[PDB]
Design a binder for these strands. Structure first.
Ligand SMILES: C[S@@+](CC[C@H](N)C(=O)[O-])C[C@H]1O[C@@H](n2cnc3c(N)ncnc32)[C@H](O)[C@@H]1O
Ligand SMILES: [Mg+2]
Ligand SMILES: [Mg+2]
Ligand SMILES: [Mg+2]
Ligand SMILES: [Mg+2]
Ligand SMILES: [Mg+2]
Ligand SMILES: [Mg+2]
Ligand SMILES: [Mg+2]
Ligand SMILES: [Mg+2]
Ligand SMILES: [Mg+2]
Ligand SMILES: [Mg+2]
Ligand SMILES: [Mg+2]
Ligand SMILES: [Mg+2]
Ligand SMILES: [Mg+2]
Ligand SMILES: [Mg+2]
Ligand SMILES: [Mg+2]
Ligand SMILES: [Mg+2]
Lengths: 95, 77, 123, 101, 179, 52, 331, 38
RNA sequence: ACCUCGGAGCAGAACCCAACCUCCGAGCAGUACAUGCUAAGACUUCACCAGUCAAAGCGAACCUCAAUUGAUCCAAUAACUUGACCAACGGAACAAGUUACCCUAGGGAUAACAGCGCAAUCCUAUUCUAGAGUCCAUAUCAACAAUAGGGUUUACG
RNA sequence: CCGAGCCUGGUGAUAGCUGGUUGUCCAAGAUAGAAUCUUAGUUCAACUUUAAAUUUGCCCACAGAACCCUCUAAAUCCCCUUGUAAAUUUAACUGUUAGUCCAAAGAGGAACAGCUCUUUGGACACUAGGAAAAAACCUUGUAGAGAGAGUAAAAAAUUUAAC
RNA sequence: ACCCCUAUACCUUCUGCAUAAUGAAUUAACUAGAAAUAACUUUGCAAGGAGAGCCAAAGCUAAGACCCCCGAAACCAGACGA
């Protein structure tokens, strides 16, 4: 990715990242399952449900995603009626 | 009864058990070979098969003649 | 588990194995022959005598008589004495009593379950 | 390979839903408070402690393939299978005073 | 018709089969492990038959006919595996040891493994002397005690078979002097 | 050999699902659960999607 | 490596060289019976059980049976299978014979013997009858383990049996509140003049069963004692309504003191839940507010929360959330 | 490396050879030789 | 001839692991149509992606099969859904030959000669006495075998 | 100096390839694998380091972990006690992953070659003594001075035909 | 001083390598680690921090401390050459 822009000399975000992942303010990232729209006739219903769910990403994936994205995307946003509002903060977390 | 084993073994597996046998041995598949390209017996890479083709035929025929009843009828095609 | 003293408690197939006279009972009446065949078979079962088959070949073309056969095996020469005496005494109505033997010229259609282990031992 | 084996050994504490064992064929048979999956996979129906015992086997009357074997078996004989059990640890619930009314 | 991977384990260890005198006084005891060819057997039959008359004295093949296949750049021939201790050829009848020993040991000389022509008495004699020697020993230290106890950490060097072998066998070779 | 085909419901209209049938078989009328009406209703063919 | 078996291994003895001569379990049921027999037999290996732990009478009987089957009209019923048995008649004379023997099992199943007398079982010889009067027309029978509402059991029951002194006892085994082991004493009668009950002295006045709300099913037993000679009972029973802490006692300790004097003869026990009547017992008779109990369940198990909950549905975070309402921090 | 069974006599590990040296048979010799005794 | 997935010969008893090679199969089929929705806790082909089991709950009723498979973008569609022998099977949207006219960066001489290892092949001597030598084992030959040594050939490594 | 002249410029072209990389001192510190137009390289994992938080880790005894195949060894998993002091989690980066030889169980098809491949263990990229020099055999590790002392491994044996 | 005893030059690429393979006649001078996110460390202020913008559920401001040298055959544009 571009560490120093040629116009302004600041970092740039990889837009491939932004249209695939949701980052929560706490530091987690959310993705969809790969192939959730693919060939559903042959898949079993349990398999289908496992596909529909929005999952988290492990530490390294999360680290890589944060490097590929600017500080703007990491700020706290007070959207009106976002369905992900509750998930922004953690609860009862000791290490 | 449907079984997927070597036809040659039948001679020593079952004997004097059948009154009627039909033996349709693997052949050069004349019409099929002239028309069909893929998996052709005449493909030059698979030359080795043809060298061991004639003996196999005898073997398979024999298995039938070993399995048939005394006075039993075998037809070979 | 092998080292534990409970080993081979699950062994079952060792208890099983995975590996001759013919009696003629011809009668003209078709209500009689099978009844006596039944009786002889019952006597065989009671005294632990092995039975193969009760085969029937078709009626002779016309007038018309039909044959009922019972295959028996495991009979000793000494035990034959008692056995044959009873089957002679029990004769209902002028029924021809025969004792025929397999003369090595008299093959079976094997079942699919039986064939697999036969193939395994063949090769 | 398929990575099939014993997941929880003897005297292991097991929460409900945990996998006890995975198997291609029926090596270990489900005992008390142990459910079997589609793929013969043994799981704990209750929280507790896993035990392995030998128990005498009677197949289902409808299950002909095993019933026939029983029929061929000589008199005096009994089949033994290895069975896996979860002994539950905590009682279902307790009664408590809410109010004096 | 099956090819076999070469299992050399057959030659290893003492012979537990055909180690008993059967209706015969004289036999050739194998002192080593080797494979017999058909050529060996050809020599065997020829020499023994031409030496003594079959009417007065009788010879017995105490070894199976060759059936172990040999693969050579495909199977070409068959061999017989023999461990040390097998009586290969038995001989009996109204005869004396002195007159048979000559041709018998001569026939044993050509054998690929070490071997000895022995009588019943002589064979049992050497069994007796060996088992006397082991109780007669003046060495506190036997291979047995050390190997089984794992005394010097010797198991690192040793094989698992050694415990069974008592240290008397090393490859195809049998050492009778070893205790 | 088989073909994948789309099934639409007469009742609780606006729901559909996919199924296999042989090409050689007759046109397929079926009974299936529709969560729109929360009832078991009849379904009918409209078109073949793909051949499998 | 092998370790030799510690006991006779199954199927070891029965094996033979030949199998063809031997009889097989031709029937499924044959094997089933043998398998059941094997389950009762103790074994050296680990087993499921370990962890989940006069002459003239015969003569009369044969005569009566022969007399019964003699009548052709009697046998005509059975062959048409349109035959009946007198239910009441069977019940009447069963109690004399096999009544107490069956009743023993029920008492030990309900664990009366283990709770009352620390496992000291007895056979209840006397056919004790207890009835509870409801209105004027019908009276509720107390059998062994029957269900009776305390609404019906609000007054003294009518007790009848064959007799020649006695002691009558009613206990709530599980009814007690302050202590686990202890029991309440409802009403005690001593030195009962045989069949007549009323003439015997009233040591404790009748008190109805009072099982609290949501405390489940309560078993209450009648115990009868064969009193050979009268005893003065200085047990500090004071008739008044009562104070519960005085009604608490242990049946085991009570019988311990009077082991040699009297012995039990008959038991009858009934089970009961809470009813509206129980409310009036606390309010009127006890002058206290009603205790209410709930069956709660232990808190659900969740594994320790991780910082990065990889390949988990989004709802993972909601498992460790305590409230469902939004929060704002310093904002 | 080589196979455990060889046509020739295989050379041992030195340790094993030292063991063979130590565990050799020793015959008992009497104080007075038996042939010389009457 | 192969490249992906599952077996068979090797795998001895938690897991994983007999390379390479030589073979057998798979790119489905049949049956339901609640192959509905939802959700504790777990398993996992040594990463990720993928894959797998499942209590309780809401609504109804009184699956077999060893593998049987394909990411993203994008395209089609009102939506629901669908799309590759992308088989080089973690898949570039779409590209073949020849070079002794050849070039550059390197690696070796993992192709050959040179130098090394074994001694399968080859050469030599002994050991046994068959059988020749018109009689006669050992004047001289020499059968079936065993035991040694050298590193001239031919292969193998 | 022509399979496409020469000069300047783009141009500090590009180079997973070769070569090089500059004071002192101390400390911790090695060889599971997976995908890859990939095996001369990357990325993930494993190992490694630092800092942090907190509680168990290592060694383990009983009990326990399969039938079938026609037969089964050294063993392994799990594991209180015990002897011990480490372990998991969290934050942040790099770097390494072409091994060879020996003992054992095997297979390659020469009973097989410091020949190829799988597993268990040892040794070698760290010091020192010994076997003749000596990667892998044996003895031995935590560092300095001494013109003190005790030790470890540590030197091959053998000689022959009369009757 | 030598004689005595002990002692297989250096760098770099390979698992060993003594030695094998590259590099050095020698002297002097010159000749090669450049930066972000995020963390840590030390300050100021603190539900607020910052000399507009930005961040904030103890954070924010400031500082400290991390990312080499030489080398192709080529390709293109414009001149110059019989
Ligand atoms: C020529 S086709 C039979 C003709 C065809 N089924 C008919 O009825 O018209 C013979 C088939 O036998 C199969 N086959 C090959 N080897 C065999 C064997 N050893 N035993 C039996 N069948 C064999 C081949 O795959 C081949 O397709
Ligand atoms: Mg295999
Ligand atoms: Mg995994
Ligand atoms: Mg795996
Ligand atoms: Mg439910
Ligand atoms: Mg690929
Ligand atoms: Mg030319
Ligand atoms: Mg490269
Ligand atoms: Mg250090
Ligand atoms: Mg890859
Ligand atoms: Mg690719
Ligand atoms: Mg490449
Ligand atoms: Mg422990
Ligand atoms: Mg290398
Ligand atoms: Mg290099
Ligand atoms: Mg050099
Ligand atoms: Mg000119």
């Amino acid at each position: 990715l571009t560490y120093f822009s040629a116009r302004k000399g600041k970092r740039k975000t990889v837009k491939a990242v932004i249209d695939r992942f949701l980052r929560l303010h706490c530091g987690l990232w959310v993705r969809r399952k790969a192939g959730y729209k693919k060939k559903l006739w042959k898949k079993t219903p349990a398999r289908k449900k496992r596909l529909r769910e929005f999952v988290f990403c492990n530490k390294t994936q999360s680290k890589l995603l944060d490097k590929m994205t600017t500080s703007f995307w990491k700020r706290r946003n007070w959207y009106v009626d976002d369905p992900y509002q509750k998930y922004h903060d953690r609860t009862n977390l000791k290490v | 009864r449907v079984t997927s084993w070597d036809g040659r073994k039948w001679g020593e597996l079952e004997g004097d058990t059948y009154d009627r046998v039909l033996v349709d041995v693997p052949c050069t598949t004349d019409r099929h070979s002239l028309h069909e390209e893929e998996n052709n017996i005449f493909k030059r890479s698979r030359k080795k098969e043809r060298q061991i083709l004639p003996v196999l035929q005898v073997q398979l025929l024999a298995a039938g003649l070993l399995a048939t009843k005394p006075g039993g009828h075998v037809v070979y095609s | 588990y092998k080292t534990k003293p409970t080993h081979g408690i699950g062994k079952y197939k060792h208890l099983i194995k995975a590996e001759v006279l013919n009696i003629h009972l011809t009668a003209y009446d078709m209500t009689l022959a099978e009844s006596y065949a039944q009786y002889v078979h019952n006597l065989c079962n009671s005294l632990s005598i092995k039975v193969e088959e009760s085969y029937a070949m078709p009626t002779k073309t016309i007038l018309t008589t039909h044959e009922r056969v019972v295959q028996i095996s495991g009979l000793s020469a000494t035990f034959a004495e008692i056995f044959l005496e009873i089957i002679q005494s029990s004769l209902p109505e002028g029924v021809r009593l025969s004792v025929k033997e397999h003369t090595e010229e008299d093959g079976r259609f094997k079942a699919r379950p039986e064939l697999e282990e036969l193939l395994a031992k063949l090769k | 390979g398929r990575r099939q084996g014993i997941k929880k050994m003897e005297g292991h504490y097991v929460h409900a839903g945990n996998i006890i064992a995975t198997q291609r064929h029926f090596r270990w048979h489900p005992g008390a408070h142990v459910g079997v999956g589609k793929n013969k996979c043994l799981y704990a129906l209750e929280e507790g402690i896993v035990r392995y015992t030998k128990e005498v086997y009677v197949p289902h009357p409808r299950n002909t393939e095993a019933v026939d074997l029983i029929t061929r078996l000589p008199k005096g004989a009994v089949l033994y299978k290895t069975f896996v059990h979860v002994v539950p640890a905590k009682p279902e619930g307790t009664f408590k005073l809410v109010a004096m009314l | 018709v099956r090819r076999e991977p070469k299992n050399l384990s057959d030659i290893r260890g003492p012979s537990t089969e055909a180690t008993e005198f059967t209706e015969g006084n004289f036999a050739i005891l194998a002192l080593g492990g080797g494979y017999l060819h058909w050529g060996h057997f050809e020599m065997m039959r020829l020499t023994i038959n031409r030496s003594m008359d079959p009417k007065n004295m009788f010879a017995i093949w105490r070894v199976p006919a060759p059936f172990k296949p040999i693969t050579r750049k495909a199977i070409d021939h068959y061999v017989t595996p023999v461990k040390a201790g097998r009586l290969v050829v038995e001989m009996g009848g109204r005869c004396e040891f002195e007159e048979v020993q000559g041709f018998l040991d001569q026939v044993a000389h050509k054998l690929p493994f070490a071997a000895k022509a022995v009588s019943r008495g002589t064979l049992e004699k050497m069994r007796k002397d060996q088992e006397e020697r082991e109780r007669n020993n003046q060495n506190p230290w036997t291979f047995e005690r050390i190997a089984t106890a794992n005394m010097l950490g010797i198991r690192k060097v040793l094989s698992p078979y050694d415990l069974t072998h008592k240290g008397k066998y090393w490859g195809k070779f049998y050492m009778p002097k070893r205790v | 050999k088989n073909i994948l085909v789309r099934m639409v419901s007469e009742a609780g209209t606006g729901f559909c699902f996919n199924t296999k049938r042989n090409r050689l078989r007759e046109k397929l009328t079926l009974l299936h659960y529709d969560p729109v009406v929360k009832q078991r209703v009849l379904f009918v063919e409209k078109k073949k999607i793909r051949s499998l | 490596r092998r370790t030799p078996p510690l006991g006779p291994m199954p199927n070891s003895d029965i094996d033979l060289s030949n199998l063809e001569r031997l009889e097989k379990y031709r029937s499924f049921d044959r094997y089933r019976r043998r398998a059941e027999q094997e389950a009762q037999a103790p074994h050296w290996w680990r087993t499921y059980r370990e962890y989940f732990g006069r002459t003239q009478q015969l003569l009369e009987r044969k005569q009566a049976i022969q007399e019964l089957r003699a009548n052709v009209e009697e046998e005509r019923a059975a062959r048409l299978r349109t035959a009946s048995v007198p239910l009441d008649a069977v019940r009447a004379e069963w109690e004399r014979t096999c009544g107490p023997y069956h009743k023993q099992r029920l008492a030990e199943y309900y664990g009366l013997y283990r709770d009352l007398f620390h496992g000291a079982t007895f056979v209840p010889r006397v056919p004790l009858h207890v009835a509870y009067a409801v209105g004027e027309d019908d009276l509720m029978p107390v059998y062994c383990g029957n269900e009776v509402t305390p609404t019906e059991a609000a007054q003294a029951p009518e007790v009848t049996y064959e007799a020649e002194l006695w002691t009558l006892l009613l206990t709530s085994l599980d009814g007690h509140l302050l202590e686990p082991d202890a029991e309440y004493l409802h009403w005690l009668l001593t030195n009962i003049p045989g069949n007549r009950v009323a003439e015997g002295q009233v040591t404790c006045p009748y008190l109805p069963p009072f099982p609290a709300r949501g405390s489940g099913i309560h078993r209450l037993a009648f115990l009868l004692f064969k009193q050979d000679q009268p005893i003065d009972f200085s047990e500090d029973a004071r008739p008044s309504c009562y104070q519960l802490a005085q009604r608490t006692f242990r049946t085991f300790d009570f019988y311990k003191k009077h082991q040699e004097t009297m012995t039990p003869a008959g038991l009858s026990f009934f089970q009961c839940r809470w009813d509206d009547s129980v409310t009036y017992i606390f309010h009127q008779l006890l002058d206290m507010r009603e205790p209410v109990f709930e069956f709660v369940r232990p808190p659900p198990y969740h594994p320790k929360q991780k910082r990065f909950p990889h390949r988990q549905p989004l709802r993972y975070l909601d498992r460790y959330r305590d409230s469902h309402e939004p929060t704002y921090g310093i904002y | 490396g080589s196979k455990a069974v060889t046509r020739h006599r295989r050379v041992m590990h030195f340790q094993r050879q030292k063991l063979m040296a130590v565990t050799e048979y020793i015959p008992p010799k009497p104080a007075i030789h038996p042939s010389c005794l009457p």
